[PDB]
Write a protein that binds this ligand. Structure first.
Ligand SMILES: *[C@@H]1O[C@H](CO)[C@@H](O[C@@H]2O[C@H](CO)[C@@H](O[C@@H]3O[C@H](CO)[C@@H](O)[C@H](O[C@H]4O[C@H](CO)[C@@H](O)[C@H](O)[C@@H]4O)[C@@H]3O)[C@H](O)[C@H]2NC(C)=O)[C@H](O)[C@H]1NC(C)=O
Ligand SMILES: *[C@@H]1O[C@H](CO)[C@@H](O[C@@H]2O[C@H](CO)[C@@H](O[C@@H]3O[C@H](CO)[C@@H](O)[C@H](O[C@H]4O[C@H](CO)[C@@H](O)[C@H](O)[C@@H]4O)[C@@H]3O)[C@H](O)[C@H]2NC(C)=O)[C@H](O)[C@H]1NC(C)=O
Ligand SMILES: *[C@@H]1O[C@H](CO)[C@@H](O[C@@H]2O[C@H](CO)[C@@H](O[C@@H]3O[C@H](CO)[C@@H](O)[C@H](O)[C@@H]3O)[C@H](O)[C@H]2NC(C)=O)[C@H](O)[C@H]1NC(C)=O
Ligand SMILES: *[C@@H]1O[C@H](CO)[C@@H](O[C@@H]2O[C@H](CO)[C@@H](O[C@@H]3O[C@H](CO)[C@@H](O)[C@H](O)[C@@H]3O)[C@H](O)[C@H]2NC(C)=O)[C@H](O)[C@H]1NC(C)=O
Ligand SMILES: *[C@@H]1O[C@H](CO[C@@H]2O[C@@H](C)[C@@H](O)[C@@H](O)[C@@H]2O)[C@@H](O[C@@H]2O[C@H](CO)[C@@H](O)[C@H](O)[C@H]2NC(C)=O)[C@H](O)[C@H]1NC(C)=O
Ligand SMILES: *[C@@H]1O[C@H](CO[C@@H]2O[C@@H](C)[C@@H](O)[C@@H](O)[C@@H]2O)[C@@H](O[C@@H]2O[C@H](CO)[C@@H](O)[C@H](O)[C@H]2NC(C)=O)[C@H](O)[C@H]1NC(C)=O
Ligand SMILES: *[C@@H]1O[C@H](CO[C@@H]2O[C@@H](C)[C@@H](O)[C@@H](O)[C@@H]2O)[C@@H](O[C@@H]2O[C@H](CO)[C@@H](O)[C@H](O)[C@H]2NC(C)=O)[C@H](O)[C@H]1NC(C)=O
Ligand SMILES: *[C@@H]1O[C@H](CO[C@@H]2O[C@@H](C)[C@@H](O)[C@@H](O)[C@@H]2O)[C@@H](O[C@@H]2O[C@H](CO)[C@@H](O)[C@H](O)[C@H]2NC(C)=O)[C@H](O)[C@H]1NC(C)=O
Ligand code: 2F9
Ligand code: 2F9
Ligand SMILES: *[C@@H]1O[C@H](CO)[C@@H](O[C@@H]2O[C@H](CO)[C@@H](O)[C@H](O)[C@H]2NC(C)=O)[C@H](O)[C@H]1NC(C)=O
Ligand SMILES: *[C@@H]1O[C@H](CO)[C@@H](O[C@@H]2O[C@H](CO)[C@@H](O)[C@H](O)[C@H]2NC(C)=O)[C@H](O)[C@H]1NC(C)=O
Ligand code: NAG
Ligand code: NAG
Ligand code: NAG
Ligand code: NAG
Ligand code: CA
Ligand code: CA
Ligand code: CL
Ligand code: CL
Ligand code: ZN
Ligand code: ZN
Ligand code: ZN
Ligand code: ZN
Lengths: 690, 690
């Protein structure tokens, strides 16, 4: 039989292992020859595996690289201008890789060039609230200072934006052992902890969904007209560089000025964590000097796009995509996800060779330049946006399959909650102590829902990965699934040269059973989306969450009862719309189970497919035209986190500090109107069509 | 048999006559009680006629009215401040209507209040080129002057915008007999000419597709959050008032300063048509003073929405819409179109009562407040934009069925050219001398295509009517058809109290046979769109026009060969895309004729339906976010006229006068890129889907 079980049984842990090993022997940095060679290999194999067509889609996009003959580093400089201490030029390479060429040294992608010199201020995680505390409470002025921030909690691009708006003239990012060294575990190669010489690479853009900084709105094809650099989207205006905690210790140990305001500002190094500005008395005339010489360069990138044509609805697309480019070896990020995709393609291809076809078309994608700002997925979606928004059923992401070995982690649209519950009930748990139990059971036990007994936690989609264009710009139902750690007791070697095949095989998943379970969840979701007669979306689950988010945003507003009275701020319209959505969704579900008629079915599947689409506002969110989903957007303070009713949330945020309350409260009301209208409009797409 | 012929034969000239008479006995000004009563009547009758559901959709929108107890007028004032001449407070009412109440006096809707006093400048038609001539060639400065302009050639809103940007402090619009009095025809009531006391009403907004000035983007429902007036869209900043040619003569006869620059600046009045500024020597100290006291007021409006549910594809909508509100009696505009719609509904309902249903759903609309800026159709489309863009097959407009009695006039998307050719070949010509000949034959003879022998002229869609939101914002294939005059040898009584039932019955269409022919063209188009198995769109006709527009825009650029060399401006990408579109369209047409399979069919009908949709850019055109169609937009100089490749056109327009040519030519190239990409993207929606 050619059914989901056949698909699932064909997936092998041993294949995923072989592919991971294959994909992680050399670096595959976006825009490099090695990553083009890997693209060609994947293309060749997906064809071998049996896909109907497999093409490269290339774009010329803005990327960023250090200067090979003018290295980036940071100094402490004395009053004579002698550099008395220099940060490292490279991470010590791991065992057996000390002769691998083309390891890009640690750098912050898209930093401008410069050699700013100044006094340090320590800004904790450089979050919005950290700067509030410094500026409003501690009265510390960052203007003209070099800020040093620890990585963690929020996307590093947001840190840089926040430092820039505070007036900083440079940013130093570092990995504190408090956030990247788990007590009682050894440093790589003897354990999975970050060594003192390890450094996290990563871009520091604020693209807000734009894709290639030079071509917002349109694919960066051969004839594209490019913005000049001064008008590019999302580039930082101050130099930025990341360091490890051996080097950080040397920069922090001399810090003077004010004490940290409390213990949430102290990491694990043997230093006081003084905020500054500047160094204590004896070293007061020493300064910190950055030397950054990286260059932004338009560079060719290559997506691989595989097609498995649907037998019945070839014009309906279910997309499985994840990136291929890596900072260095990509042992977890992304090749632990790419090896899973490769095995998924292999399995579907086995069925195809025996005469099977899915009902709908399945598209498989190996995205390029994800690490430089989701550039490959976004350019391809800009190119194909008309096909995607009229034909896109769902997008399943497939980056890193693991960041831990504890339990499942799923982030998705409410439209997929029931699909995910049902599927995981049919999968075997790989967890110790749950042999013979379902994945649903182990996941529910280890990660209970905060609101529903006997159900697992499922998180909202944020951003910082390739689903962003499909979900937040285009309104295509999206989901992701991986194995994660127990947050009560992400991974230390993230974006370091130490993230290798050996890291995974030795310390995360020696038997590749967590990879296999992730392949079954991702593959199974795709199978059901592409094959179920009725799309496996339950609009009633959206109704439930919409009420929860409405309660939540109302509560935030209700911290300001006097202003709500003065400006007549009412959430009545939003609750009314949510109530209507609930009633219409319930009635639609009845019809969906109560209708031999393929027009009614396809009519109903179109209503299901266009439901996520209905939450898109074509005017976008304020000052973020590529975030158009009115229910979800990436947090304005942290691109990784999802925010619900983001337009209202941002209008309320820090509202007590606005100098014109009338104007600020009017904008709250405007966003309430936009949200109520959008929920009601979405609900009406589920009404009888005539 | 229940077929198109049955539908067409049921339509009666005598019914249209009866309905026109019924709809034109009292004024039906938007926002008034009489127009609400008419809405209720239409709703009741459409139900009686047999539609499945007929609802009112109401909105609260910004409208504009004179002050009943503080009348608008213009004076010539002497140096003592005595008003020595006053324009009329009302048009002399026509025979038998001298006791009709609630005739709104002539005014320019949405004029601000004021009493500016100054010297006149005469600006011909107040077109972009008229102001160029004044300012650049004649060196006449309009700053602080009251401009007097003749109606005609372009939408009056554009005139006002152009006067405002020239620095005018007021605008006087008037109807010159050169443009509103045909030689050898008598004035109303003895003929169809405008009398000297007749005055054209009309709004002077520049909305650029926004709809209600207070709620751009979102329907003006009960909980809508409104912009404050100072932020409203499209309101003029200077007072404006329209007058007839008896009054105009009195204002123009004393004009001094420079002579008109040439004969294209002279109308038909016995005056010199001096441009001014100001009056000749003896009257040099007299000035012109306007008194405007109209008020903008948020007012309720009502659309009637009728549904005839489709038997097979109820989730596919073919829309027949036209407005119901009128300036006064609306004898032509709009009731000659609304009576035609009413008879069309009646006919479809007759078939429905005998057990017939169209294949697709047909929506019938009676729009309100069209005369105040397309407000009713636009608010309803904003409300229902998600249903319309995923389900909208086509929109057929139905305003004024006649402006003449000479031949057919059709404006539509190229997707409907073949449909229109085929249909008119099956209809009887109503023209004298063509008895027993087809409508196609008479129309082709009287209005030949400028490029193709043996084919009729079909024009591009501009704006200034209710299709605007469906076509230019949402990308739904749109068309219109009416009877027109012979432009070689629109109508004089437009928007005057003289536009009555009697005007039509006595002078335009005594037998109502032109109305009947228009009902057959509009009704027949709807019938075929709603009933043909394969949508009756020929994508190859778009390919042909795209090449013509590409040739045209290239030619405009080629007036600047040196700049095209300097800035490397190439149209190669646009021609390549158009070539690709032509090849793909040809291949798609082959498949369309070469495929019993309803999924392939509906797949192919979706490709047909989403083809117009593919020309929409969700970022809109520069500074006009509600004009999103990249092939067509209303002319930036004249909202009535369509412009092809509008983004490139506007980038090239007057480019030799731009102070930074590098920047201006870069924007030409950017628009070429957007256009080539959009054509290629549209073409790819017609490729095999997987
Ligand atoms: C959720 O769904 C319900 C449908 O079950 C929908 O109810 C609608 O609410 C609107 C807005 O409240 C109602 O609008 C009214 O319509 C009547 C005509 O039918 C008008 O006369 C009303 O206006 C008068 O009263 C107003 C309020 O006091 C005044 O401001 C105004 O000046 C007039 O005096 C009013 O517009 C509408 O009838 C119902 N429709 C129904 C029950 O079918 C509700 O809007 C949906 N929620 C959202 C957020 O869309
Ligand atoms: C109309 O349809 C045709 C398809 O029939 C489509 O043709 C495509 O044109 C593009 C852009 O010209 C071609 O792109 C090339 O692709 C190859 C790889 O296949 C690249 O190596 C090329 O880049 C090199 O050469 C460039 C130009 O000299 C350099 O700028 C560059 O630096 C590289 O050296 C180039 O990107 C593409 O292969 C074809 N596709 C085909 C033939 O299938 C055409 O683009 C369509 N028109 C529009 C407006 O889309
Ligand atoms: C996840 O699995 C659940 C449990 O199987 C699915 O819900 C069930 O779906 C079936 C099929 O629609 C329902 O069966 C129907 O029962 C009604 C009688 O009430 C009958 O009218 C229909 O003909 C049909 O037999 C069943 O009631 C329902 N069970 C529930 C809600 O407990 C659910 O659909 C799955 N979610 C997916 C696939 O996204
Ligand atoms: C307007 O009317 C014309 C003329 O009738 C329509 O074109 C014709 O459409 C029919 C139906 O598709 C074509 O018939 C086909 O012929 C081919 C053989 O070449 C065969 O493969 C098919 O099975 C079918 O019989 C016909 O060729 C074509 N005639 C032309 C182009 O001259 C046209 O479709 C109409 N336009 C509309 C409805 O929008
Ligand atoms: C990358 O940097 C190189 C080399 O930088 C040189 O060596 C460094 C250690 C430091 O001392 C720099 O100031 C040196 O210039 C750049 O190559 C130099 O470019 C200049 C002209 O721009 C030239 O006159 C020098 O001779 C070059 N030096 C060498 C060693 O070749 C190069 O421009 C940079 N690459 C980029 C920006 O992409
Ligand atoms: C810190 O480094 C500086 C600069 O060193 C150069 O650039 C580095 C990236 C690396 O590639 C070095 O090998 C380069 O020499 C040192 O200061 C320089 O020292 C040299 C030799 O003494 C002298 O000629 C230069 O003028 C110095 N340049 C500057 C900009 O000061 C410095 O000694 C190092 N400090 C420590 C403590 O190691
Ligand atoms: C419309 O205008 C009326 C009446 O205007 C008055 O009569 C005119 C001929 C002229 O002389 C005006 O200046 C007069 O005011 C407005 O009603 C007046 O409003 C003021 C206060 O705003 C009041 O004190 C007067 O007594 C009113 N006059 C009368 C005759 O009632 C009215 O406000 C206007 N309607 C609008 C703006 O909607
Ligand atoms: C032109 O009209 C003005 C104003 O007349 C008033 O407003 C008109 C709209 C209309 O409703 C008239 O009946 C109103 O009286 C005339 O000037 C006014 O004359 C009266 C009486 O002589 C005087 O008391 C006012 O102060 C004047 N008002 C102003 C603003 O000047 C004027 O006489 C008319 N001119 C001609 C040639 O008819
Ligand atoms: C620690 C990790 C799970 C992180 N999430 C958060 O830190 C986070 C914080 C608060 C919250 F409520 C939710 C998530 C996160 O989402 N990481 C992402 C980052 O993946 P990638 O390294 O492939 N993406 C790149 C590029 C992202 C971009 O440019 O947008 C990067 O972050 O540098 C991921 O794993 O999907
Ligand atoms: C004379 C008439 C045919 C005019 N067209 C042009 O003047 C014109 C000029 C140059 C050109 F290349 C094409 C058309 C035109 O399009 N009129 C429209 C105006 O209809 P309506 O009076 O109902 N519409 C209102 C409201 C328009 C609006 O607010 O946008 C009005 O114009 O005041 C129509 O008849 O559809
Ligand atoms: C990863 O696996 C691929 C595919 O098996 C290897 O590429 C092949 O290498 C062999 C032997 O050199 C060639 O004959 C084939 O043509 C290649 N096949 C392709 C590219 O499809 C590749 O060598 C492996 N890489 C590593 C590091 O083990
Ligand atoms: C226009 O036609 C309508 C419909 O026939 C007339 O409205 C009807 O008037 C009669 C007699 O007064 C009433 O009994 C009906 O209830 C009305 N029907 C409706 C509103 O559906 C209307 O009087 C006619 N108007 C004119 C000016 O002739
Ligand atoms: C911070 O420092 C600079 C002085 O260089 C000053 O211009 C700026 O306004 C200061 N801000 C605050 C809040 O004190
Ligand atoms: C794998 O699981 C064990 C057992 O719970 C745990 O102690 C260990 O830390 C895990 N490895 C990783 C990399 O999380
Ligand atoms: C027109 O008139 C005013 C003087 O009131 C002046 O400020 C303006 O710049 C003048 N423009 C030209 C082009 O002369
Ligand atoms: C109707 O047709 C006649 C005959 O051509 C023409 O002379 C007359 O002007 C027309 N009436 C109108 C209103 O155009
Ligand atoms: Ca782009
Ligand atoms: Ca609106
Ligand atoms: Cl993922
Ligand atoms: Cl029309
Ligand atoms: Zn990463
Ligand atoms: Zn990744
Ligand atoms: Zn009109
Ligand atoms: Zn009209």
């Amino acid at each position: 039989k050619h059914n989901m079980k056949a698909f699932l049984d064909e997936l092998k842990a041993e294949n995923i292992k072989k592919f991971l090993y294959n994909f992680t022997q050399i670096p595959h940095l976006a825009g490099t020859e090695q990553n083009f060679q890997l693209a060609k290999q994947i293309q060749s194999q997906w064809k071998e595996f049996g896909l109907d067509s497999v093409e490269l889609a290339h774009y010329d996009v803005l990327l960023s690289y250090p200067n090979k003959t003018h290295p980036n580093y940071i100094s402490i400089i004395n009053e004579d201008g002698n550099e008395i201490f220099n940060t490292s030029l490279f991470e010590p390479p791991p065992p057996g890789y000390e002769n691998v060429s083309d390891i890009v040294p640690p750098f912050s992608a898209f930093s401008p060039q410069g050699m700013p010199e100044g006094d340090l201020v320590y800004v904790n995680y450089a979050r919005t609230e950290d700067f509030f505390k410094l500026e409003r409470d501690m009265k510390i002025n960052c203007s003209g200072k070099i800020v040093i921030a620890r990585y963690g909690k929020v996307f590093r691009g947001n840190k840089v934006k926040n430092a820039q708006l505070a007036g900083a003239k440079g940013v130093i990012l570092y990995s504190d052992p408090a956030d990247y060294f788990a007590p009682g575990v050894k440093s790589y190669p003897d354990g999975w902890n970050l060594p003192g010489g390890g450094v996290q690479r990563g871009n520091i853009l604020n693209l807000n969904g734009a894709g290639d900084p030079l071509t917002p709105g349109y694919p960066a094809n051969e004839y594209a007209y490019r913005r000049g650099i001064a008008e590019a989207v999302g580039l930082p205006s101050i130099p930025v560089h990341p360091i490890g905690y051996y080097d950080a210790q040397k920069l922090l140990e001399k810090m003077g000025g004010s004490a940290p305001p409390d213990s949430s500002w102290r990491g694990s190094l043997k230093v006081p964590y003084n905020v500054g500005p500047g160094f204590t008395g004896n070293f007061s005339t020493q300064k910190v000097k950055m030397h950054i010489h990286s260059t932004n360069e338009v560079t060719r990138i290559y997506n691989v796009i595989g097609t498995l044509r649907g037998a019945v609805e070839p014009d309906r697309y279910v997309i499985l995509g994840g990136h291929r480019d890596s900072w260095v070896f990509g042992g977890i990020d992304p090749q632990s996800g790419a090896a899973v995709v490769h095995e998924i393609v292999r399995s579907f291809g086995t069925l195809k060779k025996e005469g099977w076809r899915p009902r709908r078309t399945i598209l498989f994608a190996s995205w390029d330049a994800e690490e430089f700002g989701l550039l490959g997925s976004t350019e391809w979606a800009e190119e194909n946006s008309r096909l995607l928004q009229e034909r896109g059923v769902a997008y399943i992401n497939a980056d890193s399959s693991i960041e831990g070995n504890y339990t499942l982690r799923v982030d998705c649209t409410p439209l997929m909650y029931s699909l995910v519950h049902n599927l995981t009930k049919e999968l075997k748990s790989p967890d110790e102590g749950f042999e013979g139990k379902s994945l649903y059971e182990s996941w529910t036990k280890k990660s209970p829902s905060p609101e529903f007994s006997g159900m697992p936690r499922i998180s909202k989609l944020g951003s910082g990965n390739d689903f962003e264009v499909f979900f937040q710009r285009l309104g295509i139902a999206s989901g992701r699934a991986r194995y994660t750690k127990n947050w009560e007791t992400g991974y230390p070697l993230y974006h370091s040269v130490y993230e290798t095949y050996e890291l995974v095989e030795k310390f995360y998943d020696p038997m590749f059973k967590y990879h296999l379970t992730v392949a079954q969840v991702r593959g199974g979701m795709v199978f059901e989306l592409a094959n179920s007669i009725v799309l496996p979306f339950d609009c009633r689950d959206y109704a439930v969450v919409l009420r929860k988010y409405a309660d939540k945003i109302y509560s935030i507003s209700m911290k300001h009862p006097q202003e709500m009275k003065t400006y007549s701020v009412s959430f009545d319209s939003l609750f009314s719309a949510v109530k209507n959505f609930t009633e219409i969704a319930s009635k639609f579900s009845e019809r969906l189970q109560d209708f031999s008629n393929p027009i009614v079915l396809r009519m109903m599947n179109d209503q299901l497919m266009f439901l996520e689409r209905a939450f898109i506002d074509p005017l976008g969110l304020p000052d973020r035209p590529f975030y158009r989903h009115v229910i979800y957007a990436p947090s304005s303070h942290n691109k990784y986190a999802g925010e619900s009713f983001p337009g209202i949330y941002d209008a309320l945020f820090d509202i007590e500090s606005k100098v014109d309350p009338s104007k600020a409260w009017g904008e709250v009301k405007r966003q309430i109107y936009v949200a109520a209208f959008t929920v009601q409009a979405a609900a009406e797409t589920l009404s009888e069509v005539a």
